[PDB]
Amino acid sequence: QPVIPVRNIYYMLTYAWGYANLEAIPGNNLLDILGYVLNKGVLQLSRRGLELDYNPNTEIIPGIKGRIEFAKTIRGFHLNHGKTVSTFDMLNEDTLANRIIKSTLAILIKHEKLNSTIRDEARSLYRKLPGISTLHLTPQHFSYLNGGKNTRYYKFVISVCKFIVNNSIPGQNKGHYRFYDFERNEKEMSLLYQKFLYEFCRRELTSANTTRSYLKWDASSISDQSLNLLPRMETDITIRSSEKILIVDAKYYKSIFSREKFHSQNLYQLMNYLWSLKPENGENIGGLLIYPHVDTAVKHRYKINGFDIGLCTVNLGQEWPCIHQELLDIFDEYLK
Amino acid sequence: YCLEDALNDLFIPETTIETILKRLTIKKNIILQGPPGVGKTFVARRLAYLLTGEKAPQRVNMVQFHQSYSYEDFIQGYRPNGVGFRRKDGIFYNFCQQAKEQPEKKYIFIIDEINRANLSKVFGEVMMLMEHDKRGENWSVPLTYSENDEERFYVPENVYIIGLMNTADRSLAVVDYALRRRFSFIDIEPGFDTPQFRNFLLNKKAEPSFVESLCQKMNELNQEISKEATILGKGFRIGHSYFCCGLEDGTSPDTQWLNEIVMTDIAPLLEEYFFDDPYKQQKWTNKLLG
Amino acid sequence: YCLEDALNDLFIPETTIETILKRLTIKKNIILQGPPGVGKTFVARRLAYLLTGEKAPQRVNMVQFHQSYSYEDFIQGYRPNGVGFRRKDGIFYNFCQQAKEQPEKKYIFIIDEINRANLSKVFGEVMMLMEHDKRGENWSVPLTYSENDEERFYVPENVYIIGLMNTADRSLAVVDYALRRRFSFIDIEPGFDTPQFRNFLLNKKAEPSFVESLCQKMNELNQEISKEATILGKGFRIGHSYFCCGLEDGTSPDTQWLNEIVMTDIAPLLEEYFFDDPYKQQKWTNKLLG
Amino acid sequence: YCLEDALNDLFIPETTIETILKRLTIKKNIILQGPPGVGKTFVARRLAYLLTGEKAPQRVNMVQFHQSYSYEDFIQGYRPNGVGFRRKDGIFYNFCQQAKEQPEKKYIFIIDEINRANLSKVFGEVMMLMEHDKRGENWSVPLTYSENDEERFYVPENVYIIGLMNTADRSLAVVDYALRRRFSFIDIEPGFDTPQFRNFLLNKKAEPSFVESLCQKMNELNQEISKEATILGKGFRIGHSYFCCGLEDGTSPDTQWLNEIVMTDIAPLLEEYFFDDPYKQQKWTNKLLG
Amino acid sequence: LNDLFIPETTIETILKRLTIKKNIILQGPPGVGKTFVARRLAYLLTGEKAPQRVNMVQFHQSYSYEDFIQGYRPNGVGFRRKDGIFYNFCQQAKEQPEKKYIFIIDEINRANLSKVFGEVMMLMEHDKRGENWSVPLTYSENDEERFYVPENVYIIGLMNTADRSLAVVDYALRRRFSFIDIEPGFDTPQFRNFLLNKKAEPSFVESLCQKMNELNQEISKEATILGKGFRIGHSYFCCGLEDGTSPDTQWLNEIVMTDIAPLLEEYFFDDPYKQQKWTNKLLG
Amino acid sequence: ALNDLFIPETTIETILKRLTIKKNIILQGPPGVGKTFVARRLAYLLTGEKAPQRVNMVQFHQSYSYEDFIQGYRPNGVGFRRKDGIFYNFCQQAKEQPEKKYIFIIDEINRANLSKVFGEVMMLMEHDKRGENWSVPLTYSENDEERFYVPENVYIIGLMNTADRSLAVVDYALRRRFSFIDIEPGFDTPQFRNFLLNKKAEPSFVESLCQKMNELNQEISKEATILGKGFRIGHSYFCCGLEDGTSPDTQWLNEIVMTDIAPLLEEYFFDDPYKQQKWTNKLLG
């Protein structure tokens, strides 16, 4: 049952979310890492100042505040008991974004398997935010916040809040929670990998242009021009440069972690992407298969059907900088 | 009044201007969405004289929505008189009555920064009636504060409405999809690429190299801005209004003037825009000066 | 009032209008639930004349709800005089009284944008009377502002209530509890894949292949939106009324006419819908242009 | 009034002041952004008399914004005279009427802590009007509470607006970028390493070594603060006012005097700026004293 | 200056700081006599025990600018503009310039201090006091009528340091206020001398300070969560012994379970064992 | 007023003991079980007289207020006049006849906010704190001496609808005082059948109908966390509509299936129509 050290995933999640010292914490497991980011992350915000959104308030008060609503006043006859219905803007920190932080912290404490200090420190924070009201979180709450009015820093911790709630399962007790075994499932780990690269390549490969490209089948059918039944095909990433184009397909498989047979079923998808894609520039066409391995990294090249294709691996579990060096080394070879 | 008079100084292409009148005359309600500094307020007063065909202010009405506008303000509301309250006809209701005095001559109501206010609250009854199809006596409706004696308020056919919603504040964006169908949305570009922008500068004592250098750098920046959508979307890209004004005295444009702009206005804007790494700020700031 | 004049132009199947008339005679409190641009407001005006069988305005009344709408205006309330407060019989109260005179003749009350105001705040006490079973003088009640208990108000059985609600907003996930029990919902499809919508297009000098190509796209696109539930439900999908408009001139349908519609209405709407995935906007917009 | 009267006691360089007066005559709206304790309030009354050139306080109005401030108070709104409510022309409206009487003489409005109040809500109609090229009767606008479209309010050309906004709080920032365009943003620094600040200290019988040592100390500290722009930008850095006042008695600035103020004021500040690091607090606190 | 349990140096520091700066915040945990110092201190600064000059108020989250300075509120006939206390209070000192009038604000941390003060957040500074810096208020009908802080007025702020709110931090207000910490003062003889002048046992007093200080040191151990601001005050011991009940361990045992244990629970929340330890440690 | 009630006899008897003790019951349950009907008849039973006047019924909504309920100041032609409410006036009648039992019916009580409506009186309406001793001056009372006291004769019945998904948590103030009572749909009961047997329904149609609804109601109750038990359909639809002497048969049944039951299934099953059609089919097929 071999897996990646948990700390390294957080780095990939960071690029996945598109935006610190982790050596200090002694808990290798993820929630210890993830909570310490948040627990420190909240405190980092408070230094600068949390978001305060003017919420208009229409209420019945004994006097003039802001703009009086003449209609609701006369209709309810509130003048007679010395009151008016007036609209004014109380400034609160009770916004959806901040409510989510507080509700997330409640979930974090309730998790049964967690560092005690992490749980101790967070309980302070929950008390330190009296005005904010607890909420029962759903993805629909996060859906409303896709507008992204908030600052760039807020979006990072909220992304963490999205990860925690979805990857939280009740355990021994009804109240308490237990963390999901994220590493074991390939699909979510794989979907992380594909998104990890797409945002990563934009950062480092300033030389090349990095875009996801939709592809269209060359087919025509007398039955339907739509071709809906045909598989929808959208590249994982395309990283185009003037001298050479390159398509990459990346996936996480358990079989490859064992140093035997090889799982390369994804390759079957790849040629059709090369085929359906036709470049106006006509500089070259290349493909790449990249997978995660634990122990070591090996690079091969192939000349299959007039295409220059590479199968390669990365030794996750080594260290983040050499991994960062290794990736830049990787794309340097093929992007030429 | 005619198109040649208005379009002398505008930096927007003719293409959109025809697109506006094509969409306007069929649909009668439109929205121009763009970042600040692209002449949204500037074009709007000029357009009104085109459709009327004459430079008349009476057939035009101009307002701004300030996140405190109310149905009492726009249409029908109750105001204190000296001792007791009275019912007051709002401004739009006041405008339509004049507008239906003559169907022949077109009447325009212009709302700057319309996106702010909760439009469902302001319009109320009017949200349905504004549509081109649902106009005239056929779709007459009685209002909330109308008298018990049946008296009905209908949008005249001659009326055309224009709104000017900036695209920077994301929160203040129209999410009333029922309302967003009533209006037609016209994207407006920054206006750098056009020669009509450039000729204005060359006419005002500008070097074509310095001019062509200026647009080259802005277009690079707006692409970097346009690339992101997480925080800074396509709409955030910088307008041309900063460069337009302040040269009337005879101050010719040069790197001194551009450097004053970059340090004073845009560079504060950039650090607020990015607020992640100064190096990206230091990069683009030096690029403009170079 | 012949059905042939009424129902020929309509795009909706004759199947659904029949069911609409069935439940409406039965329960008399009905809601048409669909996205904007499917003719919800359009059908409702015609249906009233169908049931009455004649074109009479008096027997049919129309209103649009909004946040300012209240019990005091709808039913009964006090309006200030120069100083004094005088009670005023409201619309719904006034409308029924006309219906009280003629119990045999069917009377219709049309309420657009009903979700915007809470029914309890406006109707209030009348939600007991409004229900189909609890109608008639047997269930008469004295009103909140009635001077004495002797004066009473009962919904005569003849009135039927129609409510037009749009499933385009996030708030409507929590549908008001009052609507579900007392009104009978009917869903209105966008209705692109219909002969009459096509037959309308073909009659206006349109190529069938260009028309049928369009129908595949709209049916295809709405499927993509309807598949989602988190952000955009089935109720958010596009209506059929962007395409109806703009043909009064006689201008034939073509990609030119279509391109104006997509760019000026449907493209920025998609930007709001698929904000997270800009490329998805490009994916569909280019598809629609083809 | 005269220029040299101000510059005697002013720590800011003249170059920034020249930049200030050049922009302000052009743009007519500005915002001064820096940490607290650098004389934003100090300069603002001084600068006004420079721009007018005459020491007239009647023409200057100075206000401090806050959360409970609105368009009703600022511009126009309905307020109680007594038994009967009246429309109360706000402070800014009254100020503009005074300036209209004397177009030649410049009239200045100074807003302290502008960043707090919801400026979009407060200014509203003014948000468009304030622009330097849109002032005058041509752009006169009817207000929310105006009886008719004919009653319209326009900013005079003479008016100059000055904004004071601290950069210590990132929660409260003028993120409304359209509003950001109207104001020309002028950064201000603490200005420790200046002659005029030191000459004031030396005038108060101070050691030149202690003075030059003092300036060197903070300059390093501010640069350390500016480094961690993610955590603390330049806007958070220490102002000079802690050191300025408190010597009115004639007390000479010995090291003991510095040791008293650091312990009482700057010491807890560093604890908050560095909540996580106790050692870093000890480092810089001890560094100044030793 | 006799029954006060805080050092003469701190009050000597305060009086010079207050006289110079004119605004101060006395911040410390509950039960350290913040109120009694300020009430005593104002009488010192005036020099006479005159209560009309001194007015005290206790802020709370719902307090507003409407209440403090100006506001529209109803008379019998209708609504009017009602001058809040501080406007009324400053007029009182404005009537009599010579004497020193004092205003005390308790539970200051809870409210949005910016919101209530508003206009005076600039004016309160010692240099900008006078007609020259006067400003028209929010609700002032005309610009001509203005409000200015008088020079004689002095403000004292009493702040609970055990309930920090990570909601709004204002470092500009911190410029207005000169912050002075207050220690509980168990070590001070003046607290002990009061009790030894109440027929306490010498060992009983000395062992008590050892007991409480060890608890106080533990609270200040983890600076992020808790600090000197959280640690225990002394004032619980002052009251309840003037009836005539001389000190004894039984008397302390009442206070520990009666008063301190919820505080311990609040501080050492979800850690009963630490409560049992530190609760029981004191009793022995 | 006790001749044919579809509810079992035990519950209606249990309530009578409960009501005479607690005096404040809440009847939960799905819509269409005659919550008003069972409550309305029970009111006559507790009195023992089929008299409407002693009984009063009002429907609460969120905008229902203290002013309507108890005391308000509505304007007359010239000036404002205090106007007695329903409950205030209601008690004045009951005070006349303490020997008799007076009953107040409150529909949709959870929907409205109880506190804003009742105000001061929420303390008194509890069974213990009743009588002249607990009399208090009202909020609008010009004179302190005039007071309002809840007499013992008054009994309060509340109807609350379980069906709504929007409902999340019951009001605290409600729970402390009232005794919640759950009414099952009782679709499978003799008295419901015997009424249907009196009408022209053969035993197979009865057994067919009773069997099918039990299976469907069981499905809704089965997914307890997903859907409350109170979502299960009631029986009132089958009661009404047969007063004309129409024979109940499968031909008649299919109308009610599509008209009333189908939208309710559509509302309850908002996710999968494929699941809905499976259950609609069994009712008829």
Ligand SMILES: Nc1nc2c(ncn2[C@@H]2O[C@H](COP(=O)(O)OP(=O)(O)NP(=O)(O)O)[C@@H](O)[C@H]2O)c(=O)[nH]1
């Ligand atoms: N001469 C000239 N000036 C232009 C042109 N376009 C914009 N401007 C100038 O840019 C400035 C602002 O234009 P404006 O209409 O107010 O832009 P806006 O979108 O309404 N501003 P905002 O979004 O902030 O409300 C004015 O000086 C305007 O005349 C143009 O084409 N020619």
Ligand SMILES: Nc1nc2c(ncn2[C@@H]2O[C@H](COP(=O)(O)OP(=O)(O)NP(=O)(O)O)[C@@H](O)[C@H]2O)c(=O)[nH]1
């Ligand atoms: N000729 C014709 N026009 C139709 C048909 N259906 C809709 N329309 C047109 O679509 C336009 C708007 O219809 P409408 O009823 O207002 O849609 P709505 O549901 O009320 N819109 P909303 O939900 O936003 O309020 C009108 O021109 C209407 O006549 C149709 O079947 N035939």
Ligand SMILES: Nc1nc2c(ncn2[C@@H]2O[C@H](COP(=O)(O)OP(=O)(O)NP(=O)(O)O)[C@@H](O)[C@H]2O)c(=O)[nH]1
């Ligand atoms: N003597 C003298 N004092 C100065 C000078 N500059 C600033 N100060 C002093 O610093 C203090 C604050 O001035 P102020 O404008 O209010 O600073 P601020 O940045 O606006 N503070 P805040 O933002 O918190 O309101 C006063 O003591 C002021 O006199 C100066 O050049 N000379």
Ligand SMILES: Nc1nc2c(ncn2[C@@H]2O[C@H](COP(=O)(O)OP(=O)(O)O)[C@@H](O)[C@H]2O)c(=O)[nH]1
């Ligand atoms: N004699 C004397 N009494 C004190 C001292 N400190 C507090 N007290 C008394 O303790 C009681 C409560 O003080 P209080 O103001 O409520 O505590 P705090 O506000 O939290 O500081 C009052 O009787 C105070 O005078 C002190 O130092 N000396």
Ligand SMILES: Nc1nc2c(ncn2[C@@H]2O[C@H](COP(=O)(O)OP(=O)(O)O)[C@@H](O)[C@H]2O)c(=O)[nH]1
């Ligand atoms: N005879 C009889 N009628 C019933 C029975 N249950 C319900 N009804 C009738 O069903 C109809 C609706 O009752 P009700 O539940 O109050 O309607 P709701 O408001 O929709 O819940 C009324 O005519 C009731 O009297 C019953 O058990 N026996």
Ligand SMILES: [Mg+2]
């Ligand atoms: Mg503008």
Ligand SMILES: [Mg+2]
């Ligand atoms: Mg409609």
Ligand SMILES: [Mg+2]
């Ligand atoms: Mg200042």
